[PDB]
Design an enzyme around this catalytic site. Structure first.
Site, PDB file in Angstrom:
ATOM      1  N   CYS A  30       0.710  -1.258  -0.260  1.00  0.00           N
ATOM      2  CA  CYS A  30       0.291  -0.066   0.175  1.00  0.00           C
ATOM      3  C   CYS A  30       0.821   1.230  -0.055  1.00  0.00           C
ATOM      4  O   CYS A  30       1.887   1.323   0.800  1.00  0.00           O
ATOM      5  CB  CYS A  30      -1.055   0.106   1.189  1.00  0.00           C
ATOM      6  SG  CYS A  30      -2.093  -1.470   1.100  1.00  0.00           S
ATOM      7  N   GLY A  31       0.450   2.232  -0.817  1.00  0.00           N
ATOM      8  CA  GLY A  31       1.290   3.669  -0.920  1.00  0.00           C
ATOM      9  C   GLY A  31       0.844   4.321  -2.252  1.00  0.00           C
ATOM     10  O   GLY A  31      -0.189   3.945  -2.955  1.00  0.00           O
ATOM     11  N   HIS A  32       1.341   5.322  -2.466  1.00  0.00           N
ATOM     12  CA  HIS A  32       1.133   6.241  -3.720  1.00  0.00           C
ATOM     13  C   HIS A  32       1.114   5.666  -4.976  1.00  0.00           C
ATOM     14  O   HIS A  32       0.619   5.949  -5.816  1.00  0.00           O
ATOM     15  CB  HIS A  32       2.264   7.555  -3.638  1.00  0.00           C
ATOM     16  CG  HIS A  32       1.956   8.445  -2.282  1.00  0.00           C
ATOM     17  ND1 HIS A  32       2.927   8.760  -1.163  1.00  0.00           N
ATOM     18  CD2 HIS A  32       0.927   9.238  -2.112  1.00  0.00           C
ATOM     19  CE1 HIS A  32       2.451   9.244  -0.555  1.00  0.00           C
ATOM     20  NE2 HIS A  32       1.180   9.709  -0.665  1.00  0.00           N
ATOM     21  N   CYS A  33       1.947   4.342  -5.094  1.00  0.00           N
ATOM     22  CA  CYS A  33       1.817   3.522  -6.301  1.00  0.00           C
ATOM     23  C   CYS A  33       0.413   3.203  -6.554  1.00  0.00           C
ATOM     24  O   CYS A  33      -0.054   3.253  -7.725  1.00  0.00           O
ATOM     25  CB  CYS A  33       2.887   2.472  -6.012  1.00  0.00           C
ATOM     26  SG  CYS A  33       2.559   1.654  -4.561  1.00  0.00           S
TER      27      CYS A  33
END
Length: 113
Positions: A33-36
């Site tokens: 999980c993240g900005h990707c």
């Protein structure tokens, strides 16, 4: 989808498909999980908008770590540029589809827009 889903098994053959576009663009990322996850649907849309203009690709740094540490990725999402299939440097604009298209328009033909 219009983004190439490259891997260490075949990446070394696909960067050579460059010619008419002059270069290939790639995004290094991870499955965590993240900005990707927020940028993926924008980078897909950029590859549709640039399909005959700028080839775009994605590579998992957790699954292709040997390429990504040699390439100095060190975090994600991380966008890079390869003129004729060889390093030109890095992407330089907003983390949006509009950023990728704008970075092309600024050199392809910014006049009479």
């Amino acid at each position: 989808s219009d983004v190439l889903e490259l891997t260490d098994d075949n990446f070394e053959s696909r960067i050579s498909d460059t010619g008419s576009a002059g270069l290939m663009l790639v995004e290094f990322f991870a499955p965590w999980c993240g900005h990707c996850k927020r940028l993926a649907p924008e980078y897909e849309a950029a590859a549709t908008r640039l399909k005959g203009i700028v080839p775009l690709a994605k590579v998992d740094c957790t699954a292709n770590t040997n390429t990504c540490n040699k390439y100095g990725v060190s975090g994600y999402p991380t966008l890079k540029i390869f003129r004729d299939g060889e390093e030109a440097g890095a992407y330089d604009g907003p983390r949006t589809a509009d950023g990728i298209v704008s970075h092309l328009k600024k050199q392809a033909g910014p006049a009479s827009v």
